Enzyme design. Structure first.
Site, mmCIF file in Angstrom:
data_model
loop_
_atom_site.group_PDB
_atom_site.id
_atom_site.type_symbol
_atom_site.label_atom_id
_atom_site.label_comp_id
_atom_site.label_asym_id
_atom_site.label_seq_id
_atom_site.Cartn_x
_atom_site.Cartn_y
_atom_site.Cartn_z
ATOM 1 C CD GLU A 59 -2.790 1.192 2.477
ATOM 2 O OE1 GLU A 59 -2.873 0.144 3.149
ATOM 3 O OE2 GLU A 59 -3.465 2.207 2.731
ATOM 4 N N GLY A 106 -11.852 1.509 7.285
ATOM 5 C CA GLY A 106 -11.472 2.052 8.577
ATOM 6 C C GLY A 106 -12.248 1.363 9.686
ATOM 7 C CG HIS A 112 -7.884 3.751 1.574
ATOM 8 N ND1 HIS A 112 -7.372 3.167 2.713
ATOM 9 C CD2 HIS A 112 -7.973 5.076 1.840
ATOM 10 C CE1 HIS A 112 -7.162 4.097 3.627
ATOM 11 N NE2 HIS A 112 -7.519 5.264 3.123
ATOM 12 C CD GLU A 168 -7.844 -6.706 18.220
ATOM 13 O OE1 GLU A 168 -8.616 -6.856 19.191
ATOM 14 O OE2 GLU A 168 -7.008 -7.573 17.889
ATOM 15 C CG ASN A 185 -3.650 -11.398 16.272
ATOM 16 O OD1 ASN A 185 -2.455 -11.157 16.433
ATOM 17 N ND2 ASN A 185 -4.368 -10.840 15.302
ATOM 18 N N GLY A 226 -10.468 -10.033 13.953
ATOM 19 C CA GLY A 226 -9.922 -9.634 15.234
ATOM 20 C C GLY A 226 -10.752 -8.513 15.834
ATOM 21 C CG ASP A 227 -10.580 -4.601 14.198
ATOM 22 O OD1 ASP A 227 -10.220 -3.832 15.118
ATOM 23 O OD2 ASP A 227 -9.899 -4.808 13.169
#
Length: 432
Positions: free
Chosen positions: A85, A109, A163, A253, A279, A417-418
């Site tokens: 990126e 986001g 993006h 997180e 994690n 994860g979020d």
């Protein structure tokens, strides 16, 4: 465990909307997805200059200032089948990309994504921080109690921070190259989120905005570099203090933070957070930066993640920050260390595991009621094996135990994860 899974879901099902409001801050953007096609790509490359583009497909630029740099960077990702990126700092190149277009739009986001989940699915009021709320940006939020402060209004009632993703499948071919793995290259026409930009109103009147929430989830810190972390971290620290003075619990997180100096700084920033989730990779990263190189490796060496190693890593984290709540999540099992006690901590973990399992099969959580689908998914073999390990080390009664004044809660898994740490954080306190 299956019975506990059913009971947990049933409770959260009815209790989650008790949360009066969740403050979500900083990073929100638009994701514009394009599925590359060889003819189109080669044609555009020839137009700008094959030789030029090729140079960048060999050496990724620092940023994208010209069209050849954009296309070359795309090729860089393709020939290697690896994600990358870069910031698009040229108006000209952004205009090029804008015209090139996209095949699909998606909310980007963690602020925007969690607003849609917590507000659009769980029905919990959300106060969101959106750097640039354009018409296109607003259209990406779902319906529901999703608001932004000036009075609170819906996004649709209010520039484009886009993006561009450029995705390609494995073996995608262009010129004489072939993608060795399905991946994507992202051109970010967004100079707000990379520096953790904060709207002026949030800098000047944060207390008034904060008062409309019961809980807060902060995200967007991971991209900060040693060069731009100064001002933003100071602002975040100021907000955290205010949140803490109001009795509002804040969660983070701990997403992988490449810059090692910022990473250490966010670790210490945790002393001002009530809760943190992570994690095995993120924990190893954090423990490593704290100087525990030995543990770090041992936390990601075995699979599933060595439970004893993870806990030692977690204990080191609490020792340096005093963070009152830690939610560790990996494939196979979740672990939480909390100053607050009770079975509600377990209810929340179980609920979040169901959400993950649901988004795993369905690929997208659209209704709260759909989480019940996770109930039929069998418990992981690895989950039972780790439990056996923890029952040897601790006196766990149905996954609950303790260590140094902190309650230890274990749960065998069947969520980016979020989705996991946010669902558990919010559901846990909806029961409180």
């Amino acid at each position: 465990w299956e019975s506990l899974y059913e009971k947990a879901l049933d409770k959260v099902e009815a209790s989650i909307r008790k949360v009066r409001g969740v403050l979500l801050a900083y990073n929100t953007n638009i994701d514009a997805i394009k599925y590359l096609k060889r003819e189109d790509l080669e044609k555009r490359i020839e137009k700008v200059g094959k030789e030029e583009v090729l140079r960048y497909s060999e050496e990724l630029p620092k940023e994208i200032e010209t069209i050849p740099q954009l296309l070359g960077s795309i090729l860089w990702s393709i020939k290697r089948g690896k994600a990358a990126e870069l910031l698009v700092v040229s108006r000209e190149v952004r205009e090029y990309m804008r015209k090139w277009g996209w095949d699909e739009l998606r909310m980007g986001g963690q602020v925007g994504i969690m607003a849609n989940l917590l507000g659009g699915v769980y029905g919990i009021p959300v106060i969101a921080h959106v750097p640039q709320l354009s018409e296109l940006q607003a259209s990406l939020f779902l319906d529901g109690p999703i608001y932004v402060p000036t009075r609170l209004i819906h996004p649709r009632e209010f520039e484009d921070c886009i993006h561009y993703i450029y995705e390609f499948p494995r073996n995608f071919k262009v010129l004489d190259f072939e993608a060795p793995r399905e991946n994507r290259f992202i051109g970010a026409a967004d100079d707000y989120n990379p520096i953790l930009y904060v709207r002026e109103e949030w800098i000047e009147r944060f207390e008034e905005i904060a008062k409309r929430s019961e809980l807060a989830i902060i995200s967007g810190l991971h991209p900060l570099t040693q060069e731009n972390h100064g001002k933003p971290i100071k602002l975040v620290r100021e907000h955290l203090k205010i949140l803490n003075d109001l009795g509002i619990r804040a969660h983070l997180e701990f997403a992988f933070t490449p810059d090692e100096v910022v990473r250490l700084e966010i670790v210490k920033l945790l002393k001002h957070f009530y809760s943190v989730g992570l994690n095995e990779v993120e924990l190893a990263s954090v423990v490593s930066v704290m100087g525990e190189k030995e543990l770090a490796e041992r936390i990601i060496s075995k699979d599933p993640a060595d439970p004893i190693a993870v806990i030692e890593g977690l204990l080191k984290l609490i020792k340096e920050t005093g963070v009152k709540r830690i939610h560790f999540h990996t494939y196979g099992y979740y672990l939480a260390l909390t100053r607050e006690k009770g079975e509600h901590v377990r209810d929340a973990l179980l609920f979040s595991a169901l959400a993950a399992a649901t988004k795993a099969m369905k690929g997208n959580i659209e209704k709260l009621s759909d989480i019940r689908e996770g109930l039929a998914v069998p418990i992981g073999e690895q989950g039972l094996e780790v439990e056996k390990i923890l029952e040897k080390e601790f006196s766990l009664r149905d996954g609950i135990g303790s260590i140094e004044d902190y309650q230890l809660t274990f749960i065998p898994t069947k969520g980016i994860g979020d989705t996991i740490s946010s669902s558990a954080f919010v559901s846990e306190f909806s029961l409180h």
